[PDB]
From a paper:
In this study, we combined structural, biochemical and biophysical approaches to study [name], a protein that belongs to Conj-T4SS of [name] from [name]. Consequently, we propose that [name] operates as a [name]-like protein in the conjugative apparatus of [name]. Biochemical and biophysical characterizations of purified [name] soluble domain and its central and C-terminal subdomains indicated that they are mainly monomeric in solution but able to form an unprecedented 6-mer oligomers.
To overcome these technical issues, and based on the secondary structure prediction of [name] as well as the sequence alignment between [name] and TcpC, we chose to express and purify to homogeneity the separate central (OrfG64–204: from Ser64 to Ala204) and C-terminal (OrfG223–331: from Ala223 to Asp331) subdomains. A native crystal allowed final model refinement to 1.75 Å resolution (R free = 20.8%). Indeed, OrfG64–204 has no α 3 (replaced by an unobservable region) and a strand β4 that clearly splits in two short portions β4a and β4b separated by a bulge that ends with Pro200. Note that the electron density of [name] central domain displayed a blob that remained unassigned despite attempts to fit various compounds in it. This density was located between β4 and the C-terminal end of α1. Surprisingly, the electron density of [name] central domain displayed an unassigned blob nicely docked in a pocket localized in a hydrophobic cavity that shares intriguing similarity with the groove identified in Gram-negative [name] proteins. Thus, the localization of this groove suggests a probable oligomerization inhibition site for [name].
Residue numbers in the entry: 92 to 133, 139 to 168, 176 to 204
The structure:
C-alpha cells in the first residue's frame, strides 16, 4: 500500500536520524514520539539513514530492511519491524519497533 509506505517512510527516517547535538536530540525524540498514539516510557544513538525498503506487511506489522550508519564508517543493515494501525483514516505507530536479522 503506497499510503502506508509514505507514512512509515517518515517514521523510519526519524528513527534513524537522531542528531548529535543534545538540544536537537530532545526535540527529535519528541518528533519521533509524535508517530505513536501513546507517550513512550523511558535506546537510539546518533545515526544517518542510507536506505530503507519496505519488504513485507503481515497483519499490522510492516517489516523494513534498513541501511544506516552510526558515527563511531561501517554501513549497518537490519530488519526493522513496525506495528501500526489506523484511526479515522490515518495511520499511526501502535508500539515500539523491534529489530530482526
Amino acid at each position: 500500500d503506497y499510503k502506508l509506505q509514505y507514512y512509515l517512510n517518515d517514521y523510519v527516517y526519524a528513527y534513524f536520524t537522531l542528531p548529535q547535538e543534545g538540544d536537537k536530540q530532545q526535540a527529535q525524540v519528541e518528533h519521533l514520539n509524535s508517530f505513536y498514539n501513546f507517550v513512550p516510557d523511558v535506546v537510539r544513538n546518533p545515526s544517518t539513514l542510507l536506505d530503507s525498503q519496505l519488504v513485507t506487511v503481515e497483519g499490522k506489522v510492516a517489516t523494513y530492511k534498513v541501511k544506516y550508519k552510526e558515527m563511531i564508517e561501517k554501513e549497518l543493515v537490519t530488519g526493522f519491524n513496525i506495528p501500526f494501525d489506523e484511526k479515522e483514516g490515518k495511520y499511526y505507530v501502535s508500539g515500539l519497533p523491534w529489530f530482526s536479522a
